Amino acid sequence: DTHKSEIAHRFNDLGEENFQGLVLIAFSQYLQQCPFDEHVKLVKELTEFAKTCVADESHAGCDKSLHTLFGDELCKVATLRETYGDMADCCEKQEPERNECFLNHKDDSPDLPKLKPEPDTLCAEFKADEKKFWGKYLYEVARRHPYFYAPELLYYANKYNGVFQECCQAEDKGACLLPKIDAMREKVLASSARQRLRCASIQKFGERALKAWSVARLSQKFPKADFTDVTKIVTDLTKVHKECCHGDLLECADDRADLAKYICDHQDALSSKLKECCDKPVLEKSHCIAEVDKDAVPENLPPLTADFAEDKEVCKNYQEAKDVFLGSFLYEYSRRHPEYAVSVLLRLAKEYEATLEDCCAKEDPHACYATVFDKLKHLVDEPQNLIKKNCELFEKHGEYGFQNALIVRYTRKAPQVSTPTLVEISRSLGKVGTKCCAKPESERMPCTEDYLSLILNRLCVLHEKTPVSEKVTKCCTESLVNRRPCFSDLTLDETYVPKPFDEKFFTFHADICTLPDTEKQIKKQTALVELLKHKPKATDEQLKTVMENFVAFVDKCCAADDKEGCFVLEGPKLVASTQAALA
Ligand SMILES: O=C(O)Cc1ccccc1Nc1c(Cl)cccc1Cl
Ligand SMILES: O=C(O)Cc1ccccc1Nc1c(Cl)cccc1Cl
Ligand SMILES: O=C(O)Cc1ccccc1Nc1c(Cl)cccc1Cl
Ligand SMILES: O=C(O)Cc1ccccc1Nc1c(Cl)cccc1Cl
Ligand SMILES: O=C(O)Cc1ccccc1Nc1c(Cl)cccc1Cl
Ligand SMILES: O=C(O)Cc1ccccc1Nc1c(Cl)cccc1Cl
Ligand code: NA
Ligand code: NA
Ligand code: NA
Ligand code: NA
Ligand code: NA
């Protein structure tokens, strides 16, 4: 029955608290530069209207689309044009174009103040008003991460409240809190980047691209499931993801809850690992299901060669329904190989497709396709060889030195990219060494390829907004499945014209001496990028000499009596020695 008030329905389904949270998240993601207490006022107006429609669904306006109602609140914001410029032009449109226009203005790098955890203040805020404290967390994250997957953010906010519940009772609040914040922050940044990649997949490559990624991932998690159980779940899951990517946050959350319930009702057909998820309350249940471990591969699965290489009829089977035959290939390959990266499984399925396209046209197709697994294996061997070599490099240098080796590599590949992005991306890539290299053998390929696909996606999302390198545009737009190898294959960009030495990056005031370590690292890594932008062909030894003099010089002026005097008067010596080392 379609005679439904949508707002009433979502309020009925989700409950007041989650409804309010999701509405607050929607406003914070679309209007990232509005204060908390202004969005709270809008949430409260829409909650009062929802409750009116719950009481009486025939009440005037209860029949508007939820998204239409929300858009209307946006366009009634007095400071819309003033703060968001021509985002206010979006107000002239009809749905769904109005919404697509709003989504166009979400800012991926709003460069908002860095949140410093002050444990004494936060514990006071928390004790003062817990709900406010909860909403302030949803607002601060959502406005920094405007594609953050909204129901997961509700889950993280409950865990964030739990952290303060335990830690505020301690004597040293700081010692309890800070390691937990740190843990949270890494999990929330990864989560943001994961959902950002799902949104950019849908938008730039079609919803079929995301479906293929999810078929591969779900078949590895739930290897006893039938192909059509996987395609049903992937279909519902992709609709949830797309709804969240399109800002339909109440519908995304409501659908997600229905999917969690479906998976728990069918847990016998899917995975034994689901049992611990399925008695949890709804947000925790869903989270637990998304993070579930790969079930054990069943015994007795026939070898892949039986259907895909050995069988006489591969071409006939393929030609009858090419898409279904390849989806089934992907599913069969993925359930069998939890130790492969999902992107490697997609690359395997693409190459299997190209082989059949080629072989099935020949006189004797079977002699040509019988050996396809030998043609495929280089797609497993190449990433395995890269992972071994990059994890060695990581163990040789440590995380910071590995970040610096990545700075050199990426600035050579993409020297037109702005310095702060080269630094951010190289720092994130270096942390993949920390996150993955010490893992069990069967987890290293999924771990490193997954993180690379998140971080290269972040580069692609930034570069889409201000494209400066043709080679980045090619790697970012050509094919999602080959994005990571496309970047690995970039060498020194030969079209790049060097800039003059940008000496501000090698000149400091005394306040450098008391920067926290992360910030000192960033100052040094920024200089390193700038070296390469001035001298793209500089040798690793030249770079090392320079950077060694650099740290020697900062060390010396930091230990001076008159620090600023040293930096200012001795500074040009560093700048001349740097130009000599590079000559
Ligand atoms: O209103 C309350 O009881 C707690 C409170 C205090 C300050 C600001 C907001 C809120 N609640 C609140 C929150 Cl935290 C999020 C969305 C909507 C509302 Cl009404
Ligand atoms: O730190 C970020 O950039 C976002 C983030 C994610 C998870 C947990 C905490 C934070 N930031 C954060 C901090 Cl560092 C302090 C107080 C309140 C918040 Cl939301
Ligand atoms: O760490 C940063 O500030 C860069 C950044 C911005 C937005 C979202 C994620 C990230 N970093 C990041 C990424 Cl892109 C992937 C996995 C894990 C992390 Cl911490
Ligand atoms: O068939 C595809 O294009 C990929 C795919 C993957 C998982 C689940 C379903 C599908 N196909 C599919 C699609 Cl793309 C749209 C609507 C319904 C279905 Cl069954
Ligand atoms: O980065 C590359 O080109 C090689 C490669 C391929 C697949 C997966 C990871 C990696 N490299 C990689 C690894 Cl294996 C660990 C930490 C950081 C990086 Cl950049
Ligand atoms: O290794 C050092 O002590 C010199 C130094 C200081 C700051 C930043 C980088 C470097 N060295 C460095 C360089 Cl210049 C390039 C690739 C890898 C490394 Cl570890
Ligand atoms: Na099946
Ligand atoms: Na729906
Ligand atoms: Na391929
Ligand atoms: Na390479
Ligand atoms: Na300077």
mmCIF file with all atom_site columns, all heavy atoms in Angstrom, residues 219 222-225 296-306 331-337:
data_model
loop_
_atom_site.group_PDB
_atom_site.id
_atom_site.type_symbol
_atom_site.label_atom_id
_atom_site.label_alt_id
_atom_site.label_comp_id
_atom_site.label_asym_id
_atom_site.label_entity_id
_atom_site.label_seq_id
_atom_site.pdbx_PDB_ins_code
_atom_site.Cartn_x
_atom_site.Cartn_y
_atom_site.Cartn_z
_atom_site.occupancy
_atom_site.B_iso_or_equiv
_atom_site.pdbx_formal_charge
_atom_site.auth_seq_id
_atom_site.auth_comp_id
_atom_site.auth_asym_id
_atom_site.auth_atom_id
_atom_site.pdbx_PDB_model_num
ATOM 1   N N   . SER A 1 219 ? 30.865 -13.493 -1.494  1.00 0.00 ? 219 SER A N   1
ATOM 2   C CA  . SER A 1 219 ? 31.101 -14.918 -1.772  1.00 0.00 ? 219 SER A CA  1
ATOM 3   C C   . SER A 1 219 ? 32.255 -15.390 -0.920  1.00 0.00 ? 219 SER A C   1
ATOM 4   O O   . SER A 1 219 ? 32.213 -16.508 -0.485  1.00 0.00 ? 219 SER A O   1
ATOM 5   C CB  . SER A 1 219 ? 31.451 -15.108 -3.234  1.00 0.00 ? 219 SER A CB  1
ATOM 6   O OG  . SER A 1 219 ? 30.376 -14.623 -4.042  1.00 0.00 ? 219 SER A OG  1
ATOM 7   N N   . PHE A 1 222 ? 30.781 -15.663 2.795   1.00 0.00 ? 222 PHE A N   1
ATOM 8   C CA  . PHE A 1 222 ? 29.667 -16.654 2.921   1.00 0.00 ? 222 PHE A CA  1
ATOM 9   C C   . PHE A 1 222 ? 29.854 -17.764 1.876   1.00 0.00 ? 222 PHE A C   1
ATOM 10  O O   . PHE A 1 222 ? 28.958 -17.928 1.007   1.00 0.00 ? 222 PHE A O   1
ATOM 11  C CB  . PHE A 1 222 ? 28.314 -15.983 2.653   1.00 0.00 ? 222 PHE A CB  1
ATOM 12  C CG  . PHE A 1 222 ? 27.937 -14.922 3.651   1.00 0.00 ? 222 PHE A CG  1
ATOM 13  C CD1 . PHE A 1 222 ? 26.950 -13.967 3.331   1.00 0.00 ? 222 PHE A CD1 1
ATOM 14  C CD2 . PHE A 1 222 ? 28.491 -14.896 4.937   1.00 0.00 ? 222 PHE A CD2 1
ATOM 15  C CE1 . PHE A 1 222 ? 26.565 -13.012 4.291   1.00 0.00 ? 222 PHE A CE1 1
ATOM 16  C CE2 . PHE A 1 222 ? 28.122 -13.933 5.900   1.00 0.00 ? 222 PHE A CE2 1
ATOM 17  C CZ  . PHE A 1 222 ? 27.168 -12.991 5.565   1.00 0.00 ? 222 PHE A CZ  1
ATOM 18  N N   . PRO A 1 223 ? 31.013 -18.489 1.896   1.00 0.00 ? 223 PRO A N   1
ATOM 19  C CA  . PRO A 1 223 ? 31.322 -19.437 0.804   1.00 0.00 ? 223 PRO A CA  1
ATOM 20  C C   . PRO A 1 223 ? 30.376 -20.662 0.706   1.00 0.00 ? 223 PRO A C   1
ATOM 21  O O   . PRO A 1 223 ? 30.289 -21.282 -0.402  1.00 0.00 ? 223 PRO A O   1
ATOM 22  C CB  . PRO A 1 223 ? 32.779 -19.873 1.091   1.00 0.00 ? 223 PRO A CB  1
ATOM 23  C CG  . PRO A 1 223 ? 32.892 -19.704 2.583   1.00 0.00 ? 223 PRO A CG  1
ATOM 24  C CD  . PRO A 1 223 ? 32.131 -18.409 2.852   1.00 0.00 ? 223 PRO A CD  1
ATOM 25  N N   . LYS A 1 224 ? 29.627 -20.967 1.781   1.00 0.00 ? 224 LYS A N   1
ATOM 26  C CA  . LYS A 1 224 ? 28.591 -21.984 1.575   1.00 0.00 ? 224 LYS A CA  1
ATOM 27  C C   . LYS A 1 224 ? 27.301 -21.523 0.892   1.00 0.00 ? 224 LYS A C   1
ATOM 28  O O   . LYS A 1 224 ? 26.554 -22.360 0.489   1.00 0.00 ? 224 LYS A O   1
ATOM 29  C CB  . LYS A 1 224 ? 28.282 -22.729 2.841   1.00 0.00 ? 224 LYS A CB  1
ATOM 30  C CG  . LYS A 1 224 ? 27.344 -22.023 3.781   1.00 0.00 ? 224 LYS A CG  1
ATOM 31  C CD  . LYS A 1 224 ? 27.272 -22.884 5.042   1.00 0.00 ? 224 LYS A CD  1
ATOM 32  C CE  . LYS A 1 224 ? 26.229 -22.321 5.957   1.00 0.00 ? 224 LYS A CE  1
ATOM 33  N NZ  . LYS A 1 224 ? 26.251 -23.116 7.214   1.00 0.00 ? 224 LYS A NZ  1
ATOM 34  N N   . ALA A 1 225 ? 27.045 -20.223 0.792   1.00 0.00 ? 225 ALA A N   1
ATOM 35  C CA  . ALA A 1 225 ? 25.843 -19.671 0.166   1.00 0.00 ? 225 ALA A CA  1
ATOM 36  C C   . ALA A 1 225 ? 25.757 -19.993 -1.332  1.00 0.00 ? 225 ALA A C   1
ATOM 37  O O   . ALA A 1 225 ? 26.764 -19.977 -2.057  1.00 0.00 ? 225 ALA A O   1
ATOM 38  C CB  . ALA A 1 225 ? 25.768 -18.134 0.397   1.00 0.00 ? 225 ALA A CB  1
ATOM 39  N N   . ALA A 1 296 ? 34.546 -20.753 6.916   1.00 0.00 ? 296 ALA A N   1
ATOM 40  C CA  . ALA A 1 296 ? 35.348 -21.795 6.369   1.00 0.00 ? 296 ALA A CA  1
ATOM 41  C C   . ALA A 1 296 ? 34.829 -22.223 4.986   1.00 0.00 ? 296 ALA A C   1
ATOM 42  O O   . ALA A 1 296 ? 33.633 -22.365 4.776   1.00 0.00 ? 296 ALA A O   1
ATOM 43  C CB  . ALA A 1 296 ? 35.300 -23.000 7.338   1.00 0.00 ? 296 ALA A CB  1
ATOM 44  N N   . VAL A 1 297 ? 35.750 -22.388 4.041   1.00 0.00 ? 297 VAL A N   1
ATOM 45  C CA  . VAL A 1 297 ? 35.419 -22.887 2.713   1.00 0.00 ? 297 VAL A CA  1
ATOM 46  C C   . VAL A 1 297 ? 34.875 -24.293 2.919   1.00 0.00 ? 297 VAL A C   1
ATOM 47  O O   . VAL A 1 297 ? 35.505 -25.044 3.584   1.00 0.00 ? 297 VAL A O   1
ATOM 48  C CB  . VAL A 1 297 ? 36.681 -22.899 1.826   1.00 0.00 ? 297 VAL A CB  1
ATOM 49  C CG1 . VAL A 1 297 ? 36.381 -23.537 0.483   1.00 0.00 ? 297 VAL A CG1 1
ATOM 50  C CG2 . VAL A 1 297 ? 37.162 -21.466 1.630   1.00 0.00 ? 297 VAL A CG2 1
ATOM 51  N N   . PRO A 1 298 ? 33.688 -24.631 2.392   1.00 0.00 ? 298 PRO A N   1
ATOM 52  C CA  . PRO A 1 298 ? 33.191 -26.035 2.517   1.00 0.00 ? 298 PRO A CA  1
ATOM 53  C C   . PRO A 1 298 ? 34.158 -27.046 1.911   1.00 0.00 ? 298 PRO A C   1
ATOM 54  O O   . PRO A 1 298 ? 34.886 -26.739 0.976   1.00 0.00 ? 298 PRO A O   1
ATOM 55  C CB  . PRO A 1 298 ? 31.922 -26.054 1.635   1.00 0.00 ? 298 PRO A CB  1
ATOM 56  C CG  . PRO A 1 298 ? 31.490 -24.627 1.640   1.00 0.00 ? 298 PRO A CG  1
ATOM 57  C CD  . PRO A 1 298 ? 32.699 -23.751 1.728   1.00 0.00 ? 298 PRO A CD  1
ATOM 58  N N   . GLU A 1 299 ? 34.099 -28.273 2.392   1.00 0.00 ? 299 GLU A N   1
ATOM 59  C CA  . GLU A 1 299 ? 34.735 -29.375 1.692   1.00 0.00 ? 299 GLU A CA  1
ATOM 60  C C   . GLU A 1 299 ? 34.017 -29.703 0.344   1.00 0.00 ? 299 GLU A C   1
ATOM 61  O O   . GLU A 1 299 ? 32.859 -29.253 0.087   1.00 0.00 ? 299 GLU A O   1
ATOM 62  C CB  . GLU A 1 299 ? 34.801 -30.578 2.637   1.00 0.00 ? 299 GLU A CB  1
ATOM 63  C CG  . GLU A 1 299 ? 35.835 -30.412 3.763   1.00 0.00 ? 299 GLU A CG  1
ATOM 64  C CD  . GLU A 1 299 ? 35.986 -31.704 4.572   1.00 0.00 ? 299 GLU A CD  1
ATOM 65  O OE1 . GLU A 1 299 ? 35.024 -32.041 5.295   1.00 0.00 ? 299 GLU A OE1 1
ATOM 66  O OE2 . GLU A 1 299 ? 37.021 -32.450 4.462   1.00 0.00 ? 299 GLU A OE2 1
ATOM 67  N N   . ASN A 1 300 ? 34.706 -30.404 -0.540  1.00 0.00 ? 300 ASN A N   1
ATOM 68  C CA  . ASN A 1 300 ? 34.014 -30.978 -1.662  1.00 0.00 ? 300 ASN A CA  1
ATOM 69  C C   . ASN A 1 300 ? 33.579 -29.989 -2.712  1.00 0.00 ? 300 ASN A C   1
ATOM 70  O O   . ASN A 1 300 ? 32.817 -30.342 -3.542  1.00 0.00 ? 300 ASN A O   1
ATOM 71  C CB  . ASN A 1 300 ? 32.847 -31.880 -1.190  1.00 0.00 ? 300 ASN A CB  1
ATOM 72  C CG  . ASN A 1 300 ? 33.382 -33.185 -0.539  1.00 0.00 ? 300 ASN A CG  1
ATOM 73  O OD1 . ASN A 1 300 ? 33.457 -33.284 0.687   1.00 0.00 ? 300 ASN A OD1 1
ATOM 74  N ND2 . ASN A 1 300 ? 33.894 -34.079 -1.347  1.00 0.00 ? 300 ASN A ND2 1
ATOM 75  N N   . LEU A 1 301 ? 34.067 -28.754 -2.719  1.00 0.00 ? 301 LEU A N   1
ATOM 76  C CA  . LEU A 1 301 ? 33.733 -27.896 -3.891  1.00 0.00 ? 301 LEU A CA  1
ATOM 77  C C   . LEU A 1 301 ? 34.546 -28.444 -5.058  1.00 0.00 ? 301 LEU A C   1
ATOM 78  O O   . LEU A 1 301 ? 35.763 -28.653 -4.927  1.00 0.00 ? 301 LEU A O   1
ATOM 79  C CB  . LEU A 1 301 ? 34.079 -26.439 -3.594  1.00 0.00 ? 301 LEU A CB  1
ATOM 80  C CG  . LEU A 1 301 ? 33.227 -25.784 -2.461  1.00 0.00 ? 301 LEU A CG  1
ATOM 81  C CD1 . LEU A 1 301 ? 33.630 -24.317 -2.343  1.00 0.00 ? 301 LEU A CD1 1
ATOM 82  C CD2 . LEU A 1 301 ? 31.690 -25.937 -2.725  1.00 0.00 ? 301 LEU A CD2 1
ATOM 83  N N   . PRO A 1 302 ? 33.888 -28.698 -6.216  1.00 0.00 ? 302 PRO A N   1
ATOM 84  C CA  . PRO A 1 302 ? 34.643 -29.212 -7.404  1.00 0.00 ? 302 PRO A CA  1
ATOM 85  C C   . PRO A 1 302 ? 35.720 -28.243 -7.828  1.00 0.00 ? 302 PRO A C   1
ATOM 86  O O   . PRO A 1 302 ? 35.620 -27.061 -7.519  1.00 0.00 ? 302 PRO A O   1
ATOM 87  C CB  . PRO A 1 302 ? 33.580 -29.289 -8.504  1.00 0.00 ? 302 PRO A CB  1
ATOM 88  C CG  . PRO A 1 302 ? 32.410 -28.528 -8.053  1.00 0.00 ? 302 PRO A CG  1
ATOM 89  C CD  . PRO A 1 302 ? 32.460 -28.395 -6.527  1.00 0.00 ? 302 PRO A CD  1
ATOM 90  N N   . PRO A 1 303 ? 36.810 -28.723 -8.459  1.00 0.00 ? 303 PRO A N   1
ATOM 91  C CA  . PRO A 1 303 ? 37.793 -27.682 -8.886  1.00 0.00 ? 303 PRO A CA  1
ATOM 92  C C   . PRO A 1 303 ? 37.188 -26.762 -9.928  1.00 0.00 ? 303 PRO A C   1
ATOM 93  O O   . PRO A 1 303 ? 36.340 -27.158 -10.725 1.00 0.00 ? 303 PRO A O   1
ATOM 94  C CB  . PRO A 1 303 ? 38.941 -28.502 -9.543  1.00 0.00 ? 303 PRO A CB  1
ATOM 95  C CG  . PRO A 1 303 ? 38.302 -29.801 -9.915  1.00 0.00 ? 303 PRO A CG  1
ATOM 96  C CD  . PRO A 1 303 ? 37.277 -30.078 -8.800  1.00 0.00 ? 303 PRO A CD  1
ATOM 97  N N   . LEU A 1 304 ? 37.649 -25.532 -9.931  1.00 0.00 ? 304 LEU A N   1
ATOM 98  C CA  . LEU A 1 304 ? 37.227 -24.511 -10.901 1.00 0.00 ? 304 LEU A CA  1
ATOM 99  C C   . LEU A 1 304 ? 37.429 -24.917 -12.315 1.00 0.00 ? 304 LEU A C   1
ATOM 100 O O   . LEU A 1 304 ? 36.665 -24.522 -13.185 1.00 0.00 ? 304 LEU A O   1
ATOM 101 C CB  . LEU A 1 304 ? 38.044 -23.221 -10.720 1.00 0.00 ? 304 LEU A CB  1
ATOM 102 C CG  . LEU A 1 304 ? 37.567 -22.272 -9.659  1.00 0.00 ? 304 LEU A CG  1
ATOM 103 C CD1 . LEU A 1 304 ? 38.476 -21.019 -9.787  1.00 0.00 ? 304 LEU A CD1 1
ATOM 104 C CD2 . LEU A 1 304 ? 36.065 -21.913 -9.827  1.00 0.00 ? 304 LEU A CD2 1
ATOM 105 N N   . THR A 1 305 ? 38.513 -25.645 -12.580 1.00 0.00 ? 305 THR A N   1
ATOM 106 C CA  . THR A 1 305 ? 38.704 -26.115 -13.949 1.00 0.00 ? 305 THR A CA  1
ATOM 107 C C   . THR A 1 305 ? 37.497 -26.910 -14.431 1.00 0.00 ? 305 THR A C   1
ATOM 108 O O   . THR A 1 305 ? 37.267 -26.883 -15.619 1.00 0.00 ? 305 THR A O   1
ATOM 109 C CB  . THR A 1 305 ? 39.971 -26.956 -14.093 1.00 0.00 ? 305 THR A CB  1
ATOM 110 O OG1 . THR A 1 305 ? 39.963 -27.964 -13.077 1.00 0.00 ? 305 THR A OG1 1
ATOM 111 C CG2 . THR A 1 305 ? 41.241 -26.104 -13.833 1.00 0.00 ? 305 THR A CG2 1
ATOM 112 N N   . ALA A 1 306 ? 36.724 -27.604 -13.561 1.00 0.00 ? 306 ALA A N   1
ATOM 113 C CA  . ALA A 1 306 ? 35.624 -28.486 -14.074 1.00 0.00 ? 306 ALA A CA  1
ATOM 114 C C   . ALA A 1 306 ? 34.621 -27.694 -14.910 1.00 0.00 ? 306 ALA A C   1
ATOM 115 O O   . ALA A 1 306 ? 34.389 -28.057 -16.070 1.00 0.00 ? 306 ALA A O   1
ATOM 116 C CB  . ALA A 1 306 ? 34.889 -29.275 -12.998 1.00 0.00 ? 306 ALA A CB  1
ATOM 117 N N   . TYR A 1 331 ? 31.823 -15.618 -8.504  1.00 0.00 ? 331 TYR A N   1
ATOM 118 C CA  . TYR A 1 331 ? 31.308 -16.164 -7.255  1.00 0.00 ? 331 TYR A CA  1
ATOM 119 C C   . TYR A 1 331 ? 32.063 -17.456 -6.937  1.00 0.00 ? 331 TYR A C   1
ATOM 120 O O   . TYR A 1 331 ? 32.552 -17.615 -5.810  1.00 0.00 ? 331 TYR A O   1
ATOM 121 C CB  . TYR A 1 331 ? 29.804 -16.412 -7.391  1.00 0.00 ? 331 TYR A CB  1
ATOM 122 C CG  . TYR A 1 331 ? 29.260 -17.549 -6.569  1.00 0.00 ? 331 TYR A CG  1
ATOM 123 C CD1 . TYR A 1 331 ? 28.938 -17.366 -5.209  1.00 0.00 ? 331 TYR A CD1 1
ATOM 124 C CD2 . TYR A 1 331 ? 29.066 -18.860 -7.139  1.00 0.00 ? 331 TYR A CD2 1
ATOM 125 C CE1 . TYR A 1 331 ? 28.442 -18.401 -4.465  1.00 0.00 ? 331 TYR A CE1 1
ATOM 126 C CE2 . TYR A 1 331 ? 28.499 -19.894 -6.389  1.00 0.00 ? 331 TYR A CE2 1
ATOM 127 C CZ  . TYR A 1 331 ? 28.194 -19.664 -5.082  1.00 0.00 ? 331 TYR A CZ  1
ATOM 128 O OH  . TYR A 1 331 ? 27.673 -20.667 -4.312  1.00 0.00 ? 331 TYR A OH  1
ATOM 129 N N   . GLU A 1 332 ? 32.194 -18.344 -7.929  1.00 0.00 ? 332 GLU A N   1
ATOM 130 C CA  . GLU A 1 332 ? 32.874 -19.593 -7.708  1.00 0.00 ? 332 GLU A CA  1
ATOM 131 C C   . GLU A 1 332 ? 34.366 -19.384 -7.342  1.00 0.00 ? 332 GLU A C   1
ATOM 132 O O   . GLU A 1 332 ? 34.920 -20.118 -6.486  1.00 0.00 ? 332 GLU A O   1
ATOM 133 C CB  . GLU A 1 332 ? 32.841 -20.501 -8.980  1.00 0.00 ? 332 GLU A CB  1
ATOM 134 C CG  . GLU A 1 332 ? 31.459 -21.012 -9.371  1.00 0.00 ? 332 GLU A CG  1
ATOM 135 C CD  . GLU A 1 332 ? 30.752 -21.952 -8.347  1.00 0.00 ? 332 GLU A CD  1
ATOM 136 O OE1 . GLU A 1 332 ? 31.274 -22.351 -7.287  1.00 0.00 ? 332 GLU A OE1 1
ATOM 137 O OE2 . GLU A 1 332 ? 29.569 -22.257 -8.559  1.00 0.00 ? 332 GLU A OE2 1
ATOM 138 N N   . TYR A 1 333 ? 35.011 -18.399 -7.967  1.00 0.00 ? 333 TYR A N   1
ATOM 139 C CA  . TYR A 1 333 ? 36.445 -18.203 -7.750  1.00 0.00 ? 333 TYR A CA  1
ATOM 140 C C   . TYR A 1 333 ? 36.633 -17.612 -6.342  1.00 0.00 ? 333 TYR A C   1
ATOM 141 O O   . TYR A 1 333 ? 37.534 -18.011 -5.603  1.00 0.00 ? 333 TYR A O   1
ATOM 142 C CB  . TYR A 1 333 ? 36.994 -17.210 -8.786  1.00 0.00 ? 333 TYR A CB  1
ATOM 143 C CG  . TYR A 1 333 ? 38.418 -17.465 -9.139  1.00 0.00 ? 333 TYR A CG  1
ATOM 144 C CD1 . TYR A 1 333 ? 38.813 -17.562 -10.509 1.00 0.00 ? 333 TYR A CD1 1
ATOM 145 C CD2 . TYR A 1 333 ? 39.412 -17.550 -8.126  1.00 0.00 ? 333 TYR A CD2 1
ATOM 146 C CE1 . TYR A 1 333 ? 40.116 -17.841 -10.844 1.00 0.00 ? 333 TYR A CE1 1
ATOM 147 C CE2 . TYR A 1 333 ? 40.709 -17.810 -8.454  1.00 0.00 ? 333 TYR A CE2 1
ATOM 148 C CZ  . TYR A 1 333 ? 41.029 -17.993 -9.829  1.00 0.00 ? 333 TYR A CZ  1
ATOM 149 O OH  . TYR A 1 333 ? 42.346 -18.238 -10.169 1.00 0.00 ? 333 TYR A OH  1
ATOM 150 N N   . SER A 1 334 ? 35.746 -16.683 -5.976  1.00 0.00 ? 334 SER A N   1
ATOM 151 C CA  . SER A 1 334 ? 35.855 -15.912 -4.714  1.00 0.00 ? 334 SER A CA  1
ATOM 152 C C   . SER A 1 334 ? 35.582 -16.788 -3.501  1.00 0.00 ? 334 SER A C   1
ATOM 153 O O   . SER A 1 334 ? 36.350 -16.737 -2.499  1.00 0.00 ? 334 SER A O   1
ATOM 154 C CB  . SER A 1 334 ? 34.882 -14.708 -4.753  1.00 0.00 ? 334 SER A CB  1
ATOM 155 O OG  . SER A 1 334 ? 35.127 -13.801 -5.851  1.00 0.00 ? 334 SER A OG  1
ATOM 156 N N   . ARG A 1 335 ? 34.554 -17.657 -3.584  1.00 0.00 ? 335 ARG A N   1
ATOM 157 C CA  . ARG A 1 335 ? 34.200 -18.532 -2.411  1.00 0.00 ? 335 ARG A CA  1
ATOM 158 C C   . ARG A 1 335 ? 35.391 -19.430 -2.132  1.00 0.00 ? 335 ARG A C   1
ATOM 159 O O   . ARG A 1 335 ? 35.658 -19.767 -0.977  1.00 0.00 ? 335 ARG A O   1
ATOM 160 C CB  . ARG A 1 335 ? 32.891 -19.330 -2.631  1.00 0.00 ? 335 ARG A CB  1
ATOM 161 C CG  . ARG A 1 335 ? 32.971 -20.332 -3.783  1.00 0.00 ? 335 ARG A CG  1
ATOM 162 C CD  . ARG A 1 335 ? 31.602 -20.678 -4.356  1.00 0.00 ? 335 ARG A CD  1
ATOM 163 N NE  . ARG A 1 335 ? 30.837 -21.334 -3.341  1.00 0.00 ? 335 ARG A NE  1
ATOM 164 C CZ  . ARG A 1 335 ? 30.206 -22.498 -3.466  1.00 0.00 ? 335 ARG A CZ  1
ATOM 165 N NH1 . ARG A 1 335 ? 30.166 -23.164 -4.628  1.00 0.00 ? 335 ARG A NH1 1
ATOM 166 N NH2 . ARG A 1 335 ? 29.536 -22.990 -2.416  1.00 0.00 ? 335 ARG A NH2 1
ATOM 167 N N   . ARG A 1 336 ? 36.149 -19.785 -3.177  1.00 0.00 ? 336 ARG A N   1
ATOM 168 C CA  . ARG A 1 336 ? 37.241 -20.699 -3.000  1.00 0.00 ? 336 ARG A CA  1
ATOM 169 C C   . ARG A 1 336 ? 38.524 -20.043 -2.451  1.00 0.00 ? 336 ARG A C   1
ATOM 170 O O   . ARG A 1 336 ? 39.458 -20.757 -1.969  1.00 0.00 ? 336 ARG A O   1
ATOM 171 C CB  . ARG A 1 336 ? 37.533 -21.427 -4.298  1.00 0.00 ? 336 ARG A CB  1
ATOM 172 C CG  . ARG A 1 336 ? 36.620 -22.597 -4.543  1.00 0.00 ? 336 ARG A CG  1
ATOM 173 C CD  . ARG A 1 336 ? 36.764 -22.945 -5.998  1.00 0.00 ? 336 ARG A CD  1
ATOM 174 N NE  . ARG A 1 336 ? 35.880 -24.042 -6.402  1.00 0.00 ? 336 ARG A NE  1
ATOM 175 C CZ  . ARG A 1 336 ? 34.553 -23.950 -6.634  1.00 0.00 ? 336 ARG A CZ  1
ATOM 176 N NH1 . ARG A 1 336 ? 33.882 -22.804 -6.502  1.00 0.00 ? 336 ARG A NH1 1
ATOM 177 N NH2 . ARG A 1 336 ? 33.886 -25.043 -7.017  1.00 0.00 ? 336 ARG A NH2 1
ATOM 178 N N   . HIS A 1 337 ? 38.636 -18.729 -2.663  1.00 0.00 ? 337 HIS A N   1
ATOM 179 C CA  . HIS A 1 337 ? 39.939 -18.125 -2.424  1.00 0.00 ? 337 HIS A CA  1
ATOM 180 C C   . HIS A 1 337 ? 39.841 -16.927 -1.470  1.00 0.00 ? 337 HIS A C   1
ATOM 181 O O   . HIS A 1 337 ? 39.966 -15.765 -1.886  1.00 0.00 ? 337 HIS A O   1
ATOM 182 C CB  . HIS A 1 337 ? 40.573 -17.741 -3.769  1.00 0.00 ? 337 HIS A CB  1
ATOM 183 C CG  . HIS A 1 337 ? 41.101 -18.927 -4.500  1.00 0.00 ? 337 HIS A CG  1
ATOM 184 N ND1 . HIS A 1 337 ? 42.278 -19.552 -4.125  1.00 0.00 ? 337 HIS A ND1 1
ATOM 185 C CD2 . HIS A 1 337 ? 40.555 -19.693 -5.482  1.00 0.00 ? 337 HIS A CD2 1
ATOM 186 C CE1 . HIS A 1 337 ? 42.447 -20.640 -4.866  1.00 0.00 ? 337 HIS A CE1 1
ATOM 187 N NE2 . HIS A 1 337 ? 41.441 -20.719 -5.724  1.00 0.00 ? 337 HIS A NE2 1
#
